[PDB]
Amino acid sequence: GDWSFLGRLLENAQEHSTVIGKVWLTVLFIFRILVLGAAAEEVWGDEQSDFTCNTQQPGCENVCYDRAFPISHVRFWVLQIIFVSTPTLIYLGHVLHLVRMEEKRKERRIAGALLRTYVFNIIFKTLFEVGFIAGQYFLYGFQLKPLYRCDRWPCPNTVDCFISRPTEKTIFILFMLAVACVSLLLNVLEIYHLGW
Amino acid sequence: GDWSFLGRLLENAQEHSTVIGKVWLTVLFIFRILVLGAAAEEVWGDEQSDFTCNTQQPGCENVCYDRAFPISHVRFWVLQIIFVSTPTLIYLGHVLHLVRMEEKRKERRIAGALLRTYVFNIIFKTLFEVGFIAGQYFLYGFQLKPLYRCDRWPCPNTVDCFISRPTEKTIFILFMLAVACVSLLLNVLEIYHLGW
Amino acid sequence: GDWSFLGRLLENAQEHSTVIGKVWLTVLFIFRILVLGAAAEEVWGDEQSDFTCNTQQPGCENVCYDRAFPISHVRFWVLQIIFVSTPTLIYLGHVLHLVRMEEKRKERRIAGALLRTYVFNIIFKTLFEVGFIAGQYFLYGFQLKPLYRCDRWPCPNTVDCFISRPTEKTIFILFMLAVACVSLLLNVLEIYHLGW
Amino acid sequence: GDWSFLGRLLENAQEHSTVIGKVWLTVLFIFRILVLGAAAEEVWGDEQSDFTCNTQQPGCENVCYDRAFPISHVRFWVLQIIFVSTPTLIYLGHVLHLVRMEEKRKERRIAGALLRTYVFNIIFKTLFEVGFIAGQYFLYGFQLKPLYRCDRWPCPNTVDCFISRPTEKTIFILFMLAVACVSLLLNVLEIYHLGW
Amino acid sequence: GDWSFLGRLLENAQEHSTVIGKVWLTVLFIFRILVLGAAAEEVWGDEQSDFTCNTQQPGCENVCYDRAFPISHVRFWVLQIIFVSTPTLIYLGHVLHLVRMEEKRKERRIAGALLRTYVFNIIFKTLFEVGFIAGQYFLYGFQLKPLYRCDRWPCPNTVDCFISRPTEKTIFILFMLAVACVSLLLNVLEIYHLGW
Amino acid sequence: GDWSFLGRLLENAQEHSTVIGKVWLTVLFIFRILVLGAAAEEVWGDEQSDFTCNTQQPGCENVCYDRAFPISHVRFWVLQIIFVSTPTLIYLGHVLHLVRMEEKRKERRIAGALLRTYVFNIIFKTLFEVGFIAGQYFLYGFQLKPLYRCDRWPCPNTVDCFISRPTEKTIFILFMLAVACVSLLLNVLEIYHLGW
C-alpha cells in the first residue's frame, strides 16, 4: 500500500488547516496509516491460510471464512481512512480554486464561503467516522472469538472453525476504535473552537 | 505496481485541467489506484491458491479456475485505469507541443484547437469507461458466487469448485463500479460546464 | 512498514531539540526502527507457521499460539515506538504554533511555556517507556522458552507446543530492553541538564 | 524490478526527441513497463508452482515446464524493452557528447550527423521490435493452450501437463503484441515525418 | 531493511572525515550493506524452512535449528554494522554541536577536542569490529557443515539434521570476515596517518 | 537489492569519465543490474524449492543442491558487479581528493597522476571481469543440464536430481557472459583510445 499521494495532498491541507485540524491529520498519519502498514497488515496476513475448520468437506473452509469475514478489518480501515480524508481534499480543492481565481483577478483565511466549506468538511468527517464505527460494531462487534460455528453449504451440519490470532486482532480492533473516537473528539473540538 | 510515472504525468495534466478535471484525477488517484494497491490486490492475492474443486482429477482445478476467471478483476481494473488515463496524456502532449512551439516562435488556455482536443479527451474517456463497465458486466456481472460448476476437460462430468473470498470480492466489485460511474458523471459535468 | 512520515516529523523535532534529545532521536531511529525493520521482523516472520504442537486435534495449534502470544513482540515494539514518539510531536507542534503566531504578529528557544511543554514531553516519554517495559515483563518476561504447555479448548488435556527461534527471539528481547533502558537514562539526563 | 535508472535516461531522450518519439516513449513507459509491473508479473507469478502434470514420476514436471516454457514471456518482454530502448540511449549519448564538445569549444537540433544517428536509432528500434515479435511467434505463437503434452525424459511415454492461467496469459500476450505493433507504426511515422 | 537514515547520517560523517575514513564508509556501504541486502539475505531466507532433520518427533526440528543457529549470521552482521557505525555518529554529533555553538557565538578541522573524539571513534570502531569477529568465531567458526547432530529434548537420542546451503553460506561467512579485516586495516591506517 | 548508493557514486564517476567509460557504466546499469533485478532474480527464486531428487532419504536433496550449486549464479553476478565497480570508485575518490586539495590550496582533466590511476582502474576492471568469467566457466560452464547425478552422503548410492528452469537459466548465463565480454571490449577500446 503506497499512501504517498494521499499524504502529499493532506500535508497541503495541513498548511491551510486549523491547529486542531493539524493534530487530526497527524493522528491519521501516525496512529492509523502507519499502524496499519507496520503492524495490522501483518497480523491479518494469514487470516485465511491459518483459518482452520474441523471437516473433510471440500469447500467448507472457503465458505466459512467468507461468512465469518465478509470484509477483512484491514480493508474496512483502509476504506475508512480514505472516506474520512475525502472532505479534507474537497476543502483543499476549494482553497486552491479560490487562490487561483485570486491570482487570475490580480492578473486581470477561514471566513466567508471558505469557512462554510471548512465546517461542512468537519461535519462530513464526523458522520463518516461515526458510520464506520457503527458499521464495524454491527458487522463484527469489538472482539474476535477463536471459535466460529459454521453451517453454510457445503459444510455438513454445523462445523467448528478456528480463527487466526483472535486476541491480537481484538487488541488492534480496540486500538483502532479508540483512535477513531479520539478523531471524533478532535472534530468536536474544532467545531467548538470555531463556534467560540 | 509502481504508478509513479503515470502519476507524475497526470499531475501535469492537473496543472492544465479544469476544476472538474482535477476532481476526476483526484478520484483516479485516491479511489482507484490507491484502493487497488492498498486493498484489492491483497483480496485477490490467493485467487488461485485458495480456489478449490471437489475432485481427484489432475489438471481440473487449473482449467476450472481459468474458465471461471479468464482475466482477474484486478488486471481488468489496471487496464481500465490506463486506458481512461490515456486521453488525458494525449491532451497534455498537445498542450506541451503548443507551449514548445510558442517558445520557438518567441525565439524566432482552453480555446481553439486545444479546446477541441480537450473535449475529444472527455469523449474518449467516457467511451472507455462505459466500455470497461459493460465488459465487466458481460464477463462477470456484479457479483461473485461462492460455487462455480465446471465441466471443462479433463474434469469428469460436472465438478463443484469454490471461490476464495466471494463476498469481499463482490464488495470491491460494486465499489469499483460506483467509482467508475462517479467518474462518468464528472465527465458529463465537464461537458456541460464547457457547453455552458 | 514505512516510517518515512514519522521520521520526517522527528527530524524537525531534532532541529528544535536539545543535544541529549538529538541523541535520543538517533537511538530511536538506529537502534529501534532500523533494527526492527532489518532484523527482528524477519526473526518473527514465521512465528505461527513454524509454531508446532504435538497433537492431531484440529484448531489446537491456533488457540495455543494465540494464548502463548496474545500480541507479538514486534507489534508491541511498534506501538512503543509510536507512543514514545508522540510527546515529541506534541512539543514540535507547540513550537510550530508559536513560530506561526510570531510570524502573524510580525505581519500585524527553550524557556517560558515552551520549556514547560518540553519538560512535560520528557516526563510522558519516561512514563510510556516505563509502562511498555513493565507490560512486556508481566506479559512475557525477558525470555522465550522453547516449550509451551497448552490446555486451551479444543486441545485435549495438556499439549506440548514448540516455539520458533526461542533463543534468537530472547536475544532481541534483551537487546530491545537494553535500548529502552538507555533511552530512559537519556531522558533522566535531559531533566538533570535542564535542572542544572 | 526497478526501472528508475532507465526511466531517468529515457526522459532525457524525451527532451531531445521528436513529438512522435515522445509518444513512443510514453507508450513504452505506460503500456509496456507499467503493465508488466502492475499486471503481467503477477499473472506469471505461479507459472511453475501451479503447473501440474498427471504423473507420479519424480522430475517430470520440472523437465516438462522447462520444455513448454524455455523462457517466460515476462522475461522476454523485459529483454525486448531493454533492447528497443538501447538505440535511444545511443542517440542521447551522441547528443550529450556533442553538447559537451560545444561547451568545451566555447570555453577554448536534428540535422547533420545527429540526424543520421537519430534515423539509425529509428531503424535499429524497428528491427529489434520486429525480431522480438517474430521470435515470440516462432517460440510460442500468440496463444497458450491449457494442455501441454510432454515426452521428455524422465517422463514415461507421453504425459499430460496443465498450464496456469492460459486464457489470461493469452490476453496479455495479444495485448503486448498490439502494443509492439503500435510502436512499429510510430517508428514508421517518425521516418515518414522526417522524410517529409 | 531500509538503511536510508543511517546512510544519510554517515554521508554527513563522510563530509567531515579523513580520506581513509571515506574509504571505510564506502566499504561499509558497498561491501557490507549492499551485499547483505542483495545477496546474503536471500541465501539465508530459507534457513529454517529448508532445515531438515531425520525424525518423526514433533518439535525436534524447531529445537535443533535453534541450537544450531542461536542467532542467524545475517542478524549478527546487521548488529555489527550498526555498532561499528555508532562511533562515527558520535563524532559527527560532536562536530555538529561545535558548529552550532560557533554559529551561536558568532551571533552573540580535526584538532583539539574534535581530534580526541575522532581518535576515540577509531578506537571504539576497532574494538567493536574485533569483538564481533571473535564472537562469530566462538559461536560458529568460519564454516558451516551440512550435518548437525542434535540431542536436545524432545529429540530422541541423537538426530541427524541437515543445513540449507552450507557452502554458499560458508563463502559469504568468509567474505564478510575478509571485509571486516579490511576495515580493521583501514582503521589502523587512520591511526598511523594521524600519528604521522 | 537496493543499488541506489552504488548508482549515485557511479554517476559521479560518469561525470569524470571518458565517453567509452560512460558507455561502460550505462551497460553496467542497464544490462547487468537492471536485468538481474527485473529478470534473473525471479528465474532463480525457486532454485532450491523446485529442485527435486528421486529419493526417500532425508537430507539428500539439501546436500545435492549444495553440491550442484555451491554459489548461485545470481550471487556470483552480484559480486562481479561490485568488484568491477570498485576500481571506478577508487579513481573517483582520487578525483574528489585532488579537487578538495585544489580548493584548499586556492583558499590558502585526465593527465598526470590522475591518468595513471584511470589506466590502472581500466586494468583492474579488465582483470576482474576476466577472473569472474573464468571462474564461472570452471565452476558451472556455460550451460545447466536438467539432470544432476549426486552421490553425496547421506544419499544412498547415486541419486537423480532435477534442476529448476535449466533452459531459461542457460539463456541468462549466456546473456550475462555476452554482456561481460562486451564490457571487456569496451575496456580494451578505452585503453586504445587513451593510447591513441
Author numbering:
A (entry chain F), B (entry chain A), C (entry chain E), D (entry chain B), E (entry chain D), F (entry chain C): 2 to 109, 137 to 224
Article sentences:
The connexins are a family of transmembrane proteins (21 isoforms in human) that form intercellular channels for cell-to-cell communication.
Structure determination by high-resolution single-particle CryoEM resulted in a high-quality 3D reconstruction, with an overall resolution of 1.90 Å (gold-standard Fourier-shell correlation (FSC)). The quality of the CryoEM map allowed for a detailed stereochemical structural refinement of both Cx46 and Cx50. Furthermore, the quality of the CryoEM map allowed for modeling previously unresolved regions of TM2 and TM3, which effectively extend the cytoplasmic vestibule of the channel by ~20 Å, as compared to our previous model, significantly augmenting the electrostatic environment of the pore entrance. Remarkably, all of the resolved lipid densities in the CryoEM map are specifically localized to the extracellular leaflet of the bilayer, indicating a selective interaction with the local lipid environment. In addition to stabilized lipids, 396 ordered water molecules are resolved throughout the channel (33 waters per subunit). Nevertheless, these stabilized rings of water are nominally positioned at the acyl-head group boundary of the extracellular lipid leaflet. These waters are stabilized by hydrogen bonds with EC1/2 residues (D67, R183/Q171, and T207/T195 in Cx50/Cx46) and expected to be further coordinated through nonspecific interactions with the phospho-glycerol backbone of the extracellular PC lipids (and discussed below). A cluster of four waters are buried within the EC1/2 domains coordinated by residues D47, E48, Y66, F70 (π bonding), S73, S204/S192, and K209/K197 in Cx50/46.
